[PDB]
Design brief:
Rubredoxin-like_dom, 3 strands, binds nickel (II) ion, 15% strand, 3-stranded antiparallel beta sheet, Rubrerythrin, domain 2, transport, mainly beta, electron transport, formylation
């Protein structure tokens, strides 16, 4: 699974770590994160995140 970066603040979503405190368990594909989830650091939505190739 790919990392994704918040292009407003630079936060790196790492699948292998997830975001457990907001309910996204380790092992979760960015695409499967609930679409109401917001960047933990800056609060913007998935739509500002870009795949890291
Ligand atoms: Ni952010």
């Amino acid at each position: 699974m790919k990392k994704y970066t918040c292009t407003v603040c630079g936060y790196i979503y790492n699948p292998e770590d997830g975001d457990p405190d907001n309910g996204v368990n380790p092992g979760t594909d960015f695409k499967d994160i609930p679409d109401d989830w917001v960047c933990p650091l800056c609060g913007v939505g998935k739509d500002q995140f870009e795949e890291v190739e």
